[PDB]
Scaffold this motif. Structure first.
Motif, mmCIF file in Angstrom:
data_model
loop_
_atom_site.group_PDB
_atom_site.id
_atom_site.type_symbol
_atom_site.label_atom_id
_atom_site.label_comp_id
_atom_site.label_asym_id
_atom_site.label_seq_id
_atom_site.Cartn_x
_atom_site.Cartn_y
_atom_site.Cartn_z
ATOM 1 N N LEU A 241 9.033 9.601 3.020
ATOM 2 C CA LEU A 241 8.340 8.386 2.622
ATOM 3 C C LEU A 241 9.327 7.280 2.271
ATOM 4 O O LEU A 241 9.230 6.162 2.790
ATOM 5 C CB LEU A 241 7.411 8.667 1.445
ATOM 6 N N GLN B 271 0.803 -1.215 0.000
ATOM 7 C CA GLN B 271 0.000 0.000 0.000
ATOM 8 C C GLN B 271 0.839 1.270 0.000
ATOM 9 O O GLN B 271 0.280 2.355 -0.187
ATOM 10 C CB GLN B 271 -0.971 -0.001 1.183
ATOM 11 N N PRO C 291 2.768 2.503 -4.508
ATOM 12 C CA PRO C 291 2.283 3.485 -5.497
ATOM 13 C C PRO C 291 2.723 4.915 -5.217
ATOM 14 O O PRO C 291 2.945 5.684 -6.166
ATOM 15 C CB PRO C 291 0.755 3.346 -5.405
ATOM 16 N N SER C 292 2.830 5.304 -3.944
ATOM 17 C CA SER C 292 3.277 6.639 -3.564
ATOM 18 C C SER C 292 4.775 6.837 -3.728
ATOM 19 O O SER C 292 5.273 7.940 -3.458
ATOM 20 C CB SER C 292 2.895 6.931 -2.115
ATOM 21 N N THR D 26 6.505 9.595 -6.557
ATOM 22 C CA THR D 26 6.422 11.009 -6.212
ATOM 23 C C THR D 26 6.654 11.263 -4.730
ATOM 24 O O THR D 26 6.457 12.390 -4.264
ATOM 25 C CB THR D 26 5.064 11.588 -6.615
ATOM 26 N N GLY D 27 7.054 10.242 -3.977
ATOM 27 C CA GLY D 27 7.178 10.393 -2.545
ATOM 28 C C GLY D 27 8.384 11.215 -2.132
ATOM 29 O O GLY D 27 9.370 11.361 -2.857
#
Ligand code: IHP
Ligand code: IHP
Ligand code: IHP
Lengths: 111, 116, 109
Positions: free
Chosen positions: C76, C64, C67-68, C71-72
């Motif tokens: 992150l 989960q 996907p971030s 652009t994290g």
């Protein structure tokens, strides 16, 4: 003075809100404080708290929140559970506790 | 200089500070908006360095658009700023946020309509 | 001085955790703090921090979070990186640094 204690639920909505128990068979019941909490939470997650004011506002929130459920913290699931009951109230679906609300939401979801 | 504000070049700040926030309104964009957008990005755990390029902003907007219909006023403000920021980087002259958004999906429209 | 570190890794997992380096050929290595941090990092992101105590828990958080990742922010990717190493430790996969850990996570995916 006043806040989200007046815009989310109507008076009659409110009086059914404060009869619903947090945990099945339990003693404690949803109050105004849970609605205030949920609305401030929605904006801290960048969601529009006005959506709490209608049955599909919440329908939309719950759709956006659900995929985070499995991995979500206690905070997320409380927010989701509160918004599930708010949905029940907006739909006039009588619920006794939070559990029955998630049940009815899945039954409505199967059909 | 200014750390977060330097995502725009000297020339880009000049056109930035000329673009109206709302169409027909008189208040315009300022440094406070870019500084804010940057800080908001890293508050959503996104890389603020992406605001430095046209496709940094392209990537950010694509990552944000799914959240737009249910998003709060702070998220729509963030999207609007990055939308305008993208048009500045792209040398696309715009006068207000509406123009920036309008051209934004003209780009996003032709992308899909020649894909199909 | 409350813990939140013996919940995540067992004593022997800790001994191997503390030999993994943050970067290949680097000198610095993972410590207790990296786990404290990762854990509070997960509650600030609305995720259940108990998922770190099992490889299955970490496997899901990575899914989960992935996907971030493009652009994290720095914050992150360091959370993701820390949890990728936590995973291989739980999985008894032996790695020397965050890069090996990330690679094996790659081929699994
Ligand atoms: O849950 P019930 O078995 O139905 O019984 C009552 C009751 O219901 P009645 O309307 O039949 O009297 C009241 O609900 P209201 O009339 O007040 O709307 C209520 O009375 P009080 O709180 O004023 O004493 C109270 O509890 P609550 O409002 O907290 O739900 C209580 O429900 P419980 O039996 O579960 O306590
Ligand atoms: O010569 P400038 O100093 O650059 O100012 C002019 C303008 O007057 P002109 O008709 O003589 O060009 C306006 O001034 P205001 O009445 O609205 O108070 C307007 O100024 P604003 O900046 O406030 O909009 C605009 O300014 P700009 O485009 O810089 O935002 C524009 O400037 P430019 O002609 O250089 O574009
Ligand atoms: O008993 P030592 O010979 O002193 O070994 C240790 C240790 O090895 P062991 O604890 O297993 O015996 C590590 O090296 P590796 O076993 O992973 O190869 C260690 O490095 P760490 O800080 O990662 O544990 C370091 O060897 P190095 O100089 O490469 O850091 C260190 O030996 P020293 O304490 O004498 O430095």
């Amino acid at each position: 003075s006043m806040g989200a204690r007046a815009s989310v639920l109507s008076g009659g909505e409110l009086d059914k809100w404060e009869k619903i128990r947090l945990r099945p068979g339990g003693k404690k019941q949803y109050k105004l404080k849970h609605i205030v909490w949920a609305s401030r939470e929605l904006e801290r997650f960048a969601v529009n708290p006005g959506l709490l004011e209608t049955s599909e506002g919440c329908r939309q929130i719950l759709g956006q929140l659900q995929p985070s459920l499995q991995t979500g913290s206690e905070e997320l699931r409380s927010l989701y559970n509160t918004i599930a009951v708010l949905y029940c109230v907006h739909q006039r679906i009588d619920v006794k506790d939070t559990k029955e609300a998630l049940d009815k939401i899945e039954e409505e979801q199967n059909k």
